[PDB]
Design a binder for this molecule. Structure first.
Ligand SMILES: N[C@@H](Cc1ccccc1)C(=O)O
Ligand SMILES: N[C@@H](Cc1ccccc1)C(=O)O
Ligand SMILES: [Mg+2]
Lengths: 265, 775, 233
């Protein structure tokens, strides 16, 4: 028999690059004891803005172009399965999860939150309205910034390096003070990559959490504890990593594209 | 090692109870495998003394006349039975462990036996049973129930690690409990020795084997049965009492881990000589076994004039002849320190493992000899009323231990604890260590009986166990790992992703022994195993698998015989051994195949296995193809080597039928590869939007030619714009050359930047057709 | 933060015994019933791809890897080593000659026992608990002092499970490592560092976990058995 002949046409599956990237990032933080947990894509203006020190009529709210929703009979669940209120919208970032988790748990802990977010923007070669982020939060007595710094540093090493390094510049966020933006050193391509933002969890955020907890009957857990959180754009990194040129490519269900990452692992 | 509560309690009086004890020991490093109650003696059994022993004419029995309060008779068959000893008398009405039948008054042979005296086996205190228990004629007032002087006991089956030879002695353990804060009671060896000279000499001709050797001298001995408490303790220790003198050597050996033997002077002659055995020397050992010696065997011999004869096997077992009996009045006492390895060799060289051998092998206190002699002689003077000479025969002066540097701070640093210096010292000191120095680093010299104590760390483990492992806090380390440790997981990870994909593709994983039956090197046409066992588990697992698949197939069989699976698809990843250890991956398919269960057809066979194989690589992003190859174990024609991404590794094919049948087996399909699979780092590539150029095309070539070369050529000539290349059909075909075939090839083309102008299409098409059969 | 790495099933008496404080003619060597091998042209690779010598045998436990890794790397680090081991023994319902172990080693300046304790404790929690707990008793091993055996609290079935042994890496082991390194041209890396290592029987745990009754079952390629764990995850 001719053995060089083709066998039975069997279906060879694959995974989406975001999933791969997500996976990779997750496995990384998992090695530092971070646990992965997801939140809801449809959130309340309360968790998305109010809980995190984001004002209504001030310049801050104006940094996130939000999608407002409408419709009845839709039940939004709070951290404890309760029903919550507030104008509905599409999570503008994964930070809200920061809150839901804290309300529902006790420090110390390390979590990481992957998730698809939405921003009202015009879709081009490097900008989308729908994309993913990865939030990170580590709360506990004693936490300091050096920890965040090491955290990110480990991440760098994990991605490139040990000939790579990290850049931390001060930046402003309503839910963290000190606030900062961090870039990473890419030894190969030779440039600095702005990865995401981070900082020391803001006091008013902790305040919020405890306040809602008590309103829910729970005892306060975040008085006298510290914490840092960070969040980074996944698509950007995935593009740099797997060498993709158009961000639109991800939500463009073309197979010739998707298959290209069949054996990525 | 058996541990009789009451006996141990004699050194550690304040023991709370066996349970608490089990606790305390677990913490010191000694796990109890069992606990037992042991000497239940019904009221029926009492102490009696044999006033008279008359033999029954015509029989091998004796009528014993006993003083059990009122006089009484029993009939015994036991040989040791005789006038002048105390015996265990179970009266009629007594319920005994062994006999479910109650003890009574039976008429035996013209004489009515009132009850019966007992053997240890019968009383349940020992295994023996081949003679009566012998007691000091005056142990108790005749009649007193025995339980009165022989209370049940609790024995712990302990596990003594090789690093704690000092623990083969109850006194060793006592010393440890003492370290915990318990009061220790060392036995005082009172002794009234005399000035006189020792009537024998000692000559150590092999000091290598007998580093330290001592001899004691006791005479005017009244050899008799051991006192109850001793018999009790020995019996509890799982040892059997003989006579006060021998019993003593055992008791002490169990007390301190120091074996010793008493030799009847009658057989010593001029003196004792510790020397290796002369080839073929003979010796009837203690167990009544006649043995021949090997020249490596160290032995304890004596000599008369120019006569040298073996008396016992050094540190393992004594001679049967020299052993102490009733008529002995003077002996020489062997208390030494032998070389472990020789003993080990010699011991295992013959079929033996004695209490002595065991201890000497694990190690004996290099300086315990003399205090041990004082202990034993003192006991003799007391229990055999021995007269003892004050002098000893000594051979070899061994050196004391040295100081071990110790830093309390370091200790804490190492444990992750915070014990105050004083607490630490106190402990070490309670363990019998000498501590000099002012701090912060101290001079600690351990007691000689402690051989496991050499380094500072050994010293730390001590404070730890004494303070208690539970007193050590819980913590987690944090650090940035040295850079050279970065990638490390890759290999392992790689192997596992693969492992996982398979299971998800449809393969059952299997685990097979790394062993191999040398015979199968034949059964399955393959070379012989390069590695063989020197101690195989069985001749059928005497080699090391060179191939994985044999085992798989074999599994197939046995599965069919147990349960009858219609089809089967599985794999296994394992290490095979050829010139180098190698990680291999093999998979086997068999059965009807897949398709509709009810509906007629199936689709299986070789092209099924390939189907899967190709999909797998499709999933791993690796280019794989197969090329016919001759394989001794694979049916030819259905044989083929495997080419992962441009490389040759492993094979794939139908199992050669000759073998298929040599085994009750039908047709099977295989493949076995070498890992790790190479990997192609992806180079992403933008796909163009401009529609592709489609084509219909067929090729007619010899029926022998392989698909390969065909696709190969067509492909290599298609041009740089060939997007796709598939095969939708082919058949031999009536309408064409008898020895040729047809080939349905679907074609696609595309240009990234722009659309493809037909000028280049039907053009490049010829570029192929030309060199197509132009070849 | 532990990283997984494997070693060779066929080892040298040097890595299996000598490197770890295990003597030739003393009681220690006598705790592992080893399978000795024979045959020529077989090339055994050392930690750096070099060829090494010593009587060949089947790794009696995964500890040898401890060495190979240290010789080949620099502290601080955390590794874990799964692997099939071999012991000459008669195969019964709870005893095999072929089975698997999981070795763990964490070396670095400052390491102490409390770390090991926490390590194991975390493992317990991870398996059962948080209503479970750990038991640490002193035990003897030639390659660790202090040495210890550890049991784990199983809240469900209500009993103590002896899991494996652990302890603070022995000084002579570190010594060995550095010595071989220099013999290989490398600079010493284990002077002034501490470390703990542990190893546990996998089959035992797997049996308790997935509720299997016969250890022989694992190497008994029966399908009806194997399939029973299809969807385990
Ligand atoms: N998710 C945030 C990033 C961030 C997270 C946490 C702290 C600071 C910044 C954003 O929308 O930009
Ligand atoms: N693998 C060892 C277990 C162990 C590992 C490390 C330290 C102590 C014990 C054994 O064979 O028993
Ligand atoms: Mg010790």
């Amino acid at each position: 028999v001719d053995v060089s002949l083709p066998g039975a046409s069997l279906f060879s599956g694959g995974l989406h690059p975001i999933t791969l990237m997500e996976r990779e990032l997750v496995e990384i933080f998992r090695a530092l004891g971070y646990q992965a947990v997801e939140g809801p894509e449809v959130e309340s203006e309360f968790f998305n803005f109010d809980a995190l020190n984001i004002p209504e009529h001030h310049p801050a709210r104006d940094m996130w172009d939000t999608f407002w929703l409408t419709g009845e009979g839709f039940r939004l669940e709070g951290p404890l399965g309760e029903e919550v209120e507030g104008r509905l919208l599409l999570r503008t970032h994964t930070s809200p999860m920061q809150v839901r988790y804290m309300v529902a748990h006790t420090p110390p802990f390390r979590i990481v939150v992957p998730g698809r977010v939405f921003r009202f923007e015009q879709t081009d070669a490097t900008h989308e309205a729908v994309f993913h982020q990865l939030e990170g939060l580590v709360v506990g007595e004693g936490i300091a910034m050096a920890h965040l710094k090491g955290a990110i540093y480990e991440l760098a090493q994990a991605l490139f390096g040990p000939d790579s390094k990290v850049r931390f510049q001060p930046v402003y966020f309503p839910f963290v003070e000190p606030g900062a933006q961090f870039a990473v050193w890419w030894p190969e391509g030779g440039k600095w990559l702005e990865l995401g933002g981070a900082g020391m969890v803001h006091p008013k955020v902790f305040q919020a959490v405890d306040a809602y907890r008590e309103r829910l009957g729970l005892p306060p857990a975040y008085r006298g504890v510290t914490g840092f959180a960070f969040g980074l754009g996944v698509e950007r990194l995935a593009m740099l990593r797997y060498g993709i040129p158009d961000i639109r490519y991800f939500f463009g269900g073309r197979l010739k594209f998707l298959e290209q990452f069949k054996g990525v692992l | 090692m058996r541990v009789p509560f009451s006996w141990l309690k004699a050194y550690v009086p304040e023991l709370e109870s066996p349970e608490v004890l089990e606790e305390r020991l677990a913490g010191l490093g000694f796990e109890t495998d069992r606990i037992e109650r042991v000497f239940p003696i019904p009221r029926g059994v009492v102490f009696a003394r044999v006033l008279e022993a008359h033999p029954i004419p015509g029989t091998r029995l004796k009528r014993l006349v006993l003083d059990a309060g009122r006089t009484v008779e029993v009939v015994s068959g036991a040989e040791n039975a005789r006038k002048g000893i105390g015996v265990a008398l179970a009266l009629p009405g007594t319920e005994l462990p062994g006999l479910g039948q109650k003890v009574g008054e039976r008429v035996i042979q013209g004489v009515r036996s009132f009850g019966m005296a007992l053997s240890p086996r019968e009383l349940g205190v020992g295994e023996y049973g081949g003679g009566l228990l012998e007691f000091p004629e005056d142990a108790l007032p005749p009649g007193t129930p025995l339980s009165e002087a022989w209370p049940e006991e609790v024995v712990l089956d302990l596990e003594v690690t090789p690093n704690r030879p000092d623990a083969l002695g109850l006194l060793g353990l006592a010393r440890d409990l003492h370290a915990l804060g318990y009061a220790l009671v060392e036995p005082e060896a009172a002794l009234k020795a005399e000035a006189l000279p020792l009537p024998f000499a000692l000559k150590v001709e092999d000091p290598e084997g007998a580093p330290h050797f001592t001899l004691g001298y006791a005479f005017g001995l009244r050899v008799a049965p051991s006192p109850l408490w001793m018999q009790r303790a020995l019996f509890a220790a799982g040892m059997r009492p003989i006579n006060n003198v021998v019993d003593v050597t055992n008791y002490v050996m169990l007390e301190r881990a120091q074996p010793m033997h008493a030799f009847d002077l009658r057989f010593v002659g001029e003196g004792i000589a510790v020397r290796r055995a002369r080839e073929g020397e003979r010796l009837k050992t203690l167990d009544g076994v006649e043995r021949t010696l090997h020249p490596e065997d160290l032995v304890i011999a004596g000599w008369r004039g120019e006569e040298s004869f073996p008396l016992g096997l050094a540190g393992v077992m004594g001679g049967a002849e020299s052993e102490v009996r009733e008529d002995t009045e003077a002996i020489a006492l062997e208390v030494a320190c032998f070389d472990p390895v020789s003993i080990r060799k010699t011991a295992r060289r013959h079929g033996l493992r004695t209490e002595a051998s065991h201890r000497f092998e694990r190690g004996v206190d290099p300086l315990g000899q003399v205090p041990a002699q004082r202990r034993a002689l003192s006991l003799l003077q007391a229990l055999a009323g021995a007269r003892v000479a004050e002098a000893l025969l000594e051979a070899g002066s061994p050196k004391p231990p040295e100081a071990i540097p110790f830093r309390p701070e370091y200790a804490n640093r190492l444990l992750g604890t915070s014990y105050p210096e004083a607490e630490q010292i106190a402990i070490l000191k309670r363990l019998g260590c000498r501590v000099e120095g002012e701090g912060p680093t101290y001079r600690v010299t351990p007691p000689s009986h402690r051989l496991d104590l050499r380094l500072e760390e050994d010293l730390v483990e001590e404070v730890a166990r004494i303070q208690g492992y539970e007193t050590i806090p819980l913590a987690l380390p944090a650090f940035f790992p040295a850079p050279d440790n970065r990638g490390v997981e890759a290999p392992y990870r790689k192997e596992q992703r693969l492992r996982e994909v398979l299971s998800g593709l449809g393969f059952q994983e299997v685990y097979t022994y790394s062993f191999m039956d040398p015979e199968d090197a034949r059964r399955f046409r393959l070379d012989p195993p390069r590695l063989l066992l020197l101690n195989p588990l069985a001749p059928e697992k005497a080699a090391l698998r060179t191939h994985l698949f044999p085992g798989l197939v074999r599994v197939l069989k046995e599965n069919l015989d147990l349960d009858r699976p219609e089809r089967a698809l599985l794999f296994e990843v394992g290490r095979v051994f050829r010139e180098r250890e190698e990680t291999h991956l093999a998979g086997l398919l068999f059965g009807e195949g897949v398709g509709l269960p009810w509906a007629k057809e199936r689709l299986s066979g070789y092209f099924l296995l390939k189907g899967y194989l190709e999909a797998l690589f499709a999933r791993l992003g690796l280019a794989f193809r197969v090329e016919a190859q001759a394989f001794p174990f694979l049916h030819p024609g259905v044989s083929g080597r495997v080419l992962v991404e441009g490389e040759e590794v492993g094979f794939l094919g139908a199992l050669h039928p000759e073998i298929a049948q040599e085994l009750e087996l039908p047709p099977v399909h295989l493949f076995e590869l070498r890992l790790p699979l190479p990997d192609k780092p992806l180079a992403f590539q933008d796909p163009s939007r401009h529609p592709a150029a489609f084509r219909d095309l067929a090729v007619v070539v010899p029926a022998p030619t392989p698909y390969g070369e065909v696709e190969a050529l067509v492909r290599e000539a298609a041009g740089p714009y060939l997007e796709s290349l598939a095969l939708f059909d082919l058949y031999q075909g009536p309408p064409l050359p008898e020895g040729h075939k047809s080939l349905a090839f679907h074609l696609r083309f595309r240009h990234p930047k722009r659309t493809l102008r037909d000028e280049e299409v039907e053009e490049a098409v010829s570029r192929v057709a030309e060199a197509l059969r132009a070849r």
